[PDB]
Design a protein around this ligand. Structure first.
Ligand SMILES: *[C@@H]1O[C@H](CO)[C@@H](O)[C@H](O)[C@H]1NC(C)=O
Ligand SMILES: *[C@@H]1O[C@H](CO)[C@@H](O)[C@H](O)[C@H]1NC(C)=O
Ligand SMILES: *[C@@H]1O[C@H](CO)[C@@H](O)[C@H](O)[C@H]1NC(C)=O
Ligand SMILES: *[C@@H]1O[C@H](CO)[C@@H](O)[C@H](O)[C@H]1NC(C)=O
Ligand SMILES: *[C@@H]1O[C@H](CO)[C@@H](O)[C@H](O)[C@H]1NC(C)=O
Ligand SMILES: *[C@@H]1O[C@H](CO)[C@@H](O)[C@H](O)[C@H]1NC(C)=O
Ligand SMILES: *[C@@H]1O[C@H](CO)[C@@H](O)[C@H](O)[C@H]1NC(C)=O
Ligand SMILES: *[C@@H]1O[C@H](CO)[C@@H](O)[C@H](O)[C@H]1NC(C)=O
Ligand SMILES: *[C@@H]1O[C@H](CO)[C@@H](O)[C@H](O)[C@H]1NC(C)=O
Ligand SMILES: *[C@@H]1O[C@H](CO)[C@@H](O)[C@H](O)[C@H]1NC(C)=O
Ligand SMILES: *[C@@H]1O[C@H](CO)[C@@H](O)[C@H](O)[C@H]1NC(C)=O
Ligand SMILES: *[C@@H]1O[C@H](CO)[C@@H](O)[C@H](O)[C@H]1NC(C)=O
Ligand SMILES: *[C@@H]1O[C@H](CO)[C@@H](O)[C@H](O)[C@H]1NC(C)=O
Ligand SMILES: *[C@@H]1O[C@H](CO)[C@@H](O)[C@H](O)[C@H]1NC(C)=O
Ligand SMILES: *[C@@H]1O[C@H](CO)[C@@H](O)[C@H](O)[C@H]1NC(C)=O
Ligand SMILES: *[C@@H]1O[C@H](CO)[C@@H](O)[C@H](O)[C@H]1NC(C)=O
Ligand SMILES: *[C@@H]1O[C@H](CO)[C@@H](O)[C@H](O)[C@H]1NC(C)=O
Ligand SMILES: *[C@@H]1O[C@H](CO)[C@@H](O)[C@H](O)[C@H]1NC(C)=O
Lengths: 443, 443, 443
């Protein structure tokens, strides 16, 4: 506000020089297209395959670059469909049909008491009726010690049936003596044959008791052998049956184990195949995500490029409007605007064609020599502050004149050159001068 | 079209007032940079690590914000490479080397017929030659019942060798009687010794047949014992061999089962490790995708911000062009345009520097009091419709004058103030007036 | 440069025609909002659920479309949080507690030497004392061949106790003869009883040796039976113990196998559940990535649409500024610009309201008939090259005049109509003419 009355210097030209100026204004823009495939993906196959799933955004970008507005609507052309091509998992069978059999888990608690008394079947054979060590040592080699040292039993008298040479000789001699005395004696002289019959009966009783002992021993051996053979047969049959049952159980367990091994191999193969497929899918997904990240980054870069191109197109349309108005105001007319039809005061302009632009040949005159003059916003001649019309107030140091800003022509301040505006109070900046008015035409 | 002759009121100013106006026009813009790391990721490490894979789009955004165009080319700087750091799967071994052995699967069908006839080896011993219950009950205690009740055989006569006291006494008495009668009789009186020899021979035959029976029984027992012992030895050896084979089979199966358990533990550990790695990778991928979604959203927001900044830069360049033309038309000249160098009719302007802008001090005069006047597009003075040049037609109610739109100065309609245009037929809006032309200069 | 003096033709109008022109200039824009949910997702639920994770970018887009700048700050509203809702893996138990027992793995190497000598326990019974085939064939049916063919032993004489009818008859006859001769002879006539006692003693010795052989055979059978029964009992007990131990081992192995099968089923079920969950998560991630790709593409399309809308808003603001300056220069004043307030030289303009725009009714006069004239940049009248001010130099073929570019009025070239500029050397294009200056006012 205070700079209004600061009597700033105004440059008023004095001389001019004709100058020719050439100006180029862009009107149209070269049609720029964008190939998103080559921009986002540089000679990459998987990149293009993944970009094919991003949609038809490149078509919208190209239509926006050509000058066609992008439509705002719903998804009547793009579908988020899925096919679910996932494979079915191989059947991992359950291990429930494997029943390993035992031998005697719980057979109603039989508890069979065998009680094999095979050791108790021993033959404790009874001895003989004697005459084994007593008679054998008492007789010796003397036949006279046969009758006087004859062994006996608990209620009988026994003698061994083994005779000797001297024994039978003495027996024959006694028999002959008895037979001789029987034919010559009437009393008891024939008693010599009594000991013969006595020892004969004793040997008979000995043979009988030995035969009885042997028969009892044979009966004992027979019954003991029968019982032992029966028990051995029973034990062997039971052992064979138990061994057969155990062998059947072992064979069943072995078959079940073979089947289990086969099913286990099948299940492990299925699990391995599933794991391999899962790992392949994981690797594919990781690679696809790592590619999509860079795809998104390059899409942001391409969107920035498209924004730049659209802003450039808008600026070129503005420059085309400027070229049209410059044509209308410089070629079809003489503009009074300063530094519009070139640089200076316009005289005449000529248009020239150009690729994507218009060339203007501006013929104007520039101020050769300029002089600074002290100016004021208004003067005051006894009130009624006057401001200049079609020109500015110019002072050379002592006098004030009115002239236009293009050329210096000092003219006296008259009423026909200025306009009154109120009084000299509101107008900031007041100088006192005299407004003459001759109005005297000559000739 | 019909509004042309609607005699619309035009505001013609009458008085003016000097006014000073200040205008600020932006020329340059403060250099704005974008830090994508801090904008997309607010103090987040994994966000920045994932953004590092999106590429160098931030460089292109900053270059676009600085005024450098984004290049449209292929991918000569970004590669979609991969290293495939996936680990190798632990070997899940197959269960094919486990062959559980059986005992007798198919040994060419031996079918060994044992036929153990151990029960048939019983000793059915034959009885004696009698004299066990018949002779024992017939004899009793009377020696006279020995010869008259003597038992016999099928073709012989047998007697037990067991004698008695009265029996041997009677035998001795008969022998003595026979020996006595032999020495006194010449005929058959010596027949008393016949029954003695008869019973002696009978006892001898009895001893012989008992010895034969015992010998046959001993032979039977011997052969039966030999056969039974042979069969028992065979059965025991076969049972021991079968038990040893079964024990070897069980031991082999147990070793195979231990090996199977070890291999099964190894395979399950490998599968568990693979599953843990797969789960970790899945969690990582899910987290990365969830982060990348918000990263893409914030990238869209940042792209919108960059678009706004670029449009603001374009508008500021347009405002700089406007400031340049305003400088040229207001400071270097006095513009005749209304409300361009401020607000009103321009007199003088002064430039002032400012940060990122130019300040203009416009000195102009605004219309103080305005008056509405009825105007017409053209008049008609006996044909040859006249339209005003350097001014408009203004009527105060009865008379029509010519004046400029900035100040009210009624002037008479003359030929030097108007221009003829055809006739009064095509021009829409026709009023009849008189175009005077004194052309009389005084003094 | 060379086209300046090319005497190009300038079109100077001669007649005019009043024309009314209507112009529409957009000022404001209809408030456009963007619904990202319906644009990116067309009637899709999972698409909207996934877009909800992209953030509040739609709010920023709408605020930018409304005219509010997008803020550039850190992430004080969006968090990249995670909850880690991953399930815990079912415990895959290890197979370490399964200890399959053997029978005799390494029991300090007992190596028990059984050495069952059951075959060596045979009864090789000794024969009798003869008289089985020799005496039986030598005796026959003649009692006389009994004493003369009597068998003997190695040191004794034995005879079988089996007599015959003729044998006992001859014995009785010899005994009777001896008893008769004993009573009538004094010498050795009683020797007839010697062979009787001899054969009696021989039969006694035979019975004795047969009894001894039978007793020895019974002792042999007894000891052999005892030893064989002991060995058989030992073997049976050992076999039963080994069979019981093997049965216990088989039962333990079967129980361990059942437990192993149960644990294996549990582990396989756990692995199957884990694999199913992993497959479900993989399918979900794949579908989500395939949706996010198209979401990103449509987001790029929407960003392009927003950029277009913002550029249109900027252009509409520029058109509003143009409408304001056209209002100020055509309605509030008469502009001297050609083809600015319509098409032609402006006379008066009238404003009319319109939805989102201002309608201008421009009243102007267009050049009816135009004539081409040869123009020059400057003339030369004895040096001091003159260029026209407020008009251009126009020649009709022989004479040069000064006139304005809007109407054809030939005026004589005077000093008050031209300006001197240096000399006729620098000014490109020089023509020689005469600059008159009458300055003679009449009347
Ligand atoms: C006004 O005039 C004074 C007197 O010489 C001078 O000092 C001052 O600089 C002038 N103001 C301008 C040129 O703005
Ligand atoms: C095996 O079979 C037996 C009888 O056939 C039955 O009692 C048992 O429950 C079964 N065990 C299994 C695991 O099927
Ligand atoms: C007029 O004033 C300007 C203001 O800086 C100055 O640059 C110029 O040299 C001055 N001209 C003369 C002739 O003094
Ligand atoms: C200013 O112009 C007047 C008018 O011609 C003249 O008399 C005077 O000498 C000039 N110079 C000064 C310093 O006043
Ligand atoms: C306003 O204009 C009228 C027109 O004649 C004039 O008489 C009057 O003095 C003016 N007033 C001011 C304050 O300029
Ligand atoms: C102009 O004249 C008035 C009237 O006397 C006076 O008040 C004022 O100070 C004068 N101004 C100048 C600059 O001489
Ligand atoms: C034209 O003049 C008539 C007569 O008073 C008036 O009613 C009408 O409003 C005028 N038309 C305008 C001012 O546009
Ligand atoms: C086991 O071995 C036997 C003979 O050694 C053979 O016949 C059989 O096919 C084998 N079984 C397996 C499953 O290898
Ligand atoms: C001139 O006409 C305009 C049109 O609305 C009106 O606003 C204004 O008040 C009028 N002025 C006079 C002095 O009648
Ligand atoms: C209009 O102007 C004329 C010309 O001076 C004048 O005679 C007349 O009184 C004014 N007013 C009317 C209503 O005509
Ligand atoms: C066209 O201009 C010529 C120039 O003298 C004039 O004679 C003629 O009447 C004009 N015609 C029209 C229709 O304005
Ligand atoms: C002007 O005069 C002509 C010639 O008689 C006549 O036809 C026309 O109606 C008049 N117009 C007016 C507005 O008086
Ligand atoms: C200049 O005048 C010559 C002479 O007729 C003519 O051939 C040439 O075309 C003119 N140059 C123009 C019209 O630019
Ligand atoms: C099984 O147990 C035995 C003794 O109880 C031991 O020596 C052996 O190492 C064990 N084996 C396993 C695999 O635990
Ligand atoms: C004036 O020159 C232009 C330039 O091509 C031409 O189109 C037009 O017809 C010419 N007019 C006359 C009247 O020769
Ligand atoms: C050109 O204008 C002059 C000046 O009136 C005139 O004498 C002449 O006949 C016109 N035509 C030519 C061809 O000079
Ligand atoms: C510059 O202007 C002065 C002002 O009188 C004049 O005398 C001189 O001749 C001019 N010089 C040129 C080269 O125009
Ligand atoms: C103009 O006159 C000068 C002075 O004699 C002469 O040198 C020049 O050639 C003339 N130019 C023309 C176009 O006649």
């Amino acid at each position: 506000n205070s700079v209004a009355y600061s009597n700033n210097s105004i440059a008023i030209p004095t001389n001019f020089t004709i100058s020719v100026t050439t100006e180029i204004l862009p009107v149209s823009m070269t049609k720029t297209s964008v190939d998103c495939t080559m921009y986002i993906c540089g000679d990459s196959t998987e990149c293009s395959n993944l970009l094919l799933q991003y949609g038809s955004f490149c078509t919208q970008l190209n239509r926006a670059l050509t000058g066609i507005a992008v439509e705002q609507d719903k998804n009547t052309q793009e579908v988020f469909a899925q096919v679910k091509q996932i494979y079915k998992t191989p059947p991992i069978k359950d291990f429930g049909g494997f029943n390993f059999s035992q031998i005697l888990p719980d057979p109603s608690k039989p508890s069979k008491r065998s009680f094999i008394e095979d050791l108790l079947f021993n033959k404790v054979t009874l001895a003989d009726a004697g005459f084994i060590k007593q008679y054998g040592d008492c007789l010796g080699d003397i036949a006279a010690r046969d009758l006087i040292c004859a062994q006996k039993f608990n209620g009988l008298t026994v003698l061994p049936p083994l005779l000797t040479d001297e024994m039978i000789a003495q027996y024959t001699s006694a028999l002959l003596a008895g037979t001789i005395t029987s034919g010559w004696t009437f009393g008891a002289g024939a008693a010599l044959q009594i000991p013969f019959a006595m020892q004969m009966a004793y040997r008979f009783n000995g043979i009988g008791v030995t035969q009885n002992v042997l028969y009892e021993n044979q009966k004992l051996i027979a019954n003991q052998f029968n019982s032992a053979i029966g028990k051995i047969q029973d034990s062997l049959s039971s052992t064979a049956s138990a061994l057969g049952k155990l062998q059947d159980v072992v064979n069943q367990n072995a078959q079940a184990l073979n089947t289990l091994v086969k099913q286990l191999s099948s299940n492990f193969g299925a699990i391995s195949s599933v794991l391999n497929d899962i790992l392949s899918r994981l690797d594919k997904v990781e690679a696809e995500v790592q590619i999509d990240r860079l795809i998104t980054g390059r899409l942001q870069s391409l969107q920035t490029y498209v924004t730049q191109q659209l802003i450039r197109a808008a600026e070129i349309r503005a420059s085309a409007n400027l070229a049209a108005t410059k044509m209308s105001e410089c070629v079809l007319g003489q503009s009074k605007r300063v530094d519009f039809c070139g640089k200076g005061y316009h005289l005449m302009s000529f248009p020239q064609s150009a690729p994507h632009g218009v060339v203007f040949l501006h013929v104007t005159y520039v101020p050769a020599q300029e002089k600074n003059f002290t100016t004021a916003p208004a003067i005051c001649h006894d009130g009624k502050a006057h401001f200049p019309r079609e020109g500015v107030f110019v002072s050379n140091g002592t006098h004030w004149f009115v002239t236009q800003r293009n050329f210096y022509e000092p003219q006296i301040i008259t009423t026909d050159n200025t306009f009154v505006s109120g009084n000299c109070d509101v107008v900031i900046g007041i100088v006192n001068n005299t407004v003459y008015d001759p109005l005297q035409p000559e000739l």
